[PDB]
From a paper:
A class I chitinase from the carnivorous sundew plant [name] was successfully expressed in the methylotrophic yeast Pichia pastoris and efficiently purified using a chitin affinity column. In D. adelae chitinase, a characteristic tyrosine cluster consisting of Tyr174, Tyr199, and Tyr201 formed a unique structural feature that enabled recognition of the (GlcNAc)4 substrate. The hevein domain structures further indicated that the tyrosine cluster (Tyr41, Tyr43, Tyr50) in D. adelae chitinase may be involved in hydrogen bonding and CH/π interactions with (GlcNAc)3.
Crystallization of wild‐type and E167Q catalytic mutant chitinases yielded needle‐like microcrystals. X‐ray diffraction experiments were performed, and high‐resolution datasets were obtained at 1.73 Å and 1.57 Å, respectively. Structural analysis of diffraction data revealed that only the catalytic domain could be resolved in both crystal forms. Further, the structure of the chitin‐binding domain (hevein domain), which could not be resolved by X‐ray crystallography, was predicted using alphafold.
Residue numbers in the entry: 79 to 321
Write the structure that this text describes.
């Protein structure tokens, strides 16, 4: 069970400032919601030895902290204490509707980034809602109004391979075997390939990038909290994005 690796105190010490009034998602993300959701995904934080389960959770909270960070360079307790500050895409996001007969856009509904993985677009809310048996296509606001659902979308993303792009789960648990194409593209198992899976088109293969360095900093802080050392191949600066 995942609760033997991650306690309420480890969750709270990682997500130290999420409940500050400056965070729009303050009061949303609970340890209970996380454990309820985690238990629905067989293998999630229960694959491998203790250090491998710790590493998976460090990596999962690292990446999701980046997706939702409200941190700045000089924030209280540093930038890597301000994960899980947002539950919806910032700026003025549009409806993120790309029509699908399989996963049709609901009238008046918007599919902008919500929750810990910032799940976006009607196609993804529909694929996800099918997998977790929730009406995300008709009510995408559930991902920001129900914290158990919010965590389910992020773990769903984390556990789901995309053809030649592995699950974050496989990579974080040392179960990803890189293809010859992967090797030629510099995609060596590590946290960097996880950044590549999540947003490599934007962030990877272009040299030093502050968003990548941010993802690493969260993961480094959380490895410390779990009492493990970070893995190798932390960045994707010299990785070709997954096409
Ligand atoms: C609202 C919040 O607490 N945090 C920050 C904001 O103040 C910050 O300066 C900027 C990037 O550093 O984006 C937000 O996420």
């Amino acid at each position: 069970d995942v609760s033997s690796i991650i306690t309420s105190q480890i969750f709270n010490q990682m997500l130290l400032h999420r409940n500050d009034n400056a965070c729009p998602a303050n009061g949303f993300y609970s340890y209970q919601a996380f454990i309820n959701a985690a238990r629905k995904f067989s293998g999630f934080g229960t694959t491998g030895d203790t250090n491998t389960r710790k590493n998976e959770l460090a990596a999962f909270f690292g990446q999701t902290s980046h997706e939702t960070t409200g941190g700045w360079s000089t924030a209280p307790d540093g930038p890597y204490a301000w994960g899980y500050c947002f539950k919806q895409e910032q700026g003025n996001p549009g409806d993120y509707c790309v029509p699908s007969s399989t996963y049709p856009c609901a009238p008046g509904k918007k599919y902008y980034g919500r929750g810990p993985i910032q799940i976006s677009y009607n196609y993804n809310y529909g694929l996800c809602g099918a997998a977790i048996n929730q009406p995300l296509l008709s009510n995408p606001g559930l991902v920001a109004s129900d914290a158990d659902i919010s965590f389910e979308t992020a773990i769903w993303f984390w556990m789901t391979p995309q053809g030649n792009k592995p699950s974050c789960h496989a990579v974080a648990t040392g179960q990803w075997n890189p293809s010859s194409a992967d090797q030629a593209a510099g995609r060596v198992p590590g946290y960097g390939v996880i950044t590549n899976i999540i947003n490599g088109g934007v962030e990877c293969g272009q040299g030093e990038k502050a968003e990548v360095a941010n993802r690493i900093g969260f993961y480094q802080r959380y490895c410390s909290i779990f009492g493990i050392s970070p893995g190798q191949n932390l960045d994707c600066y010299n990785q070709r994005p997954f096409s």
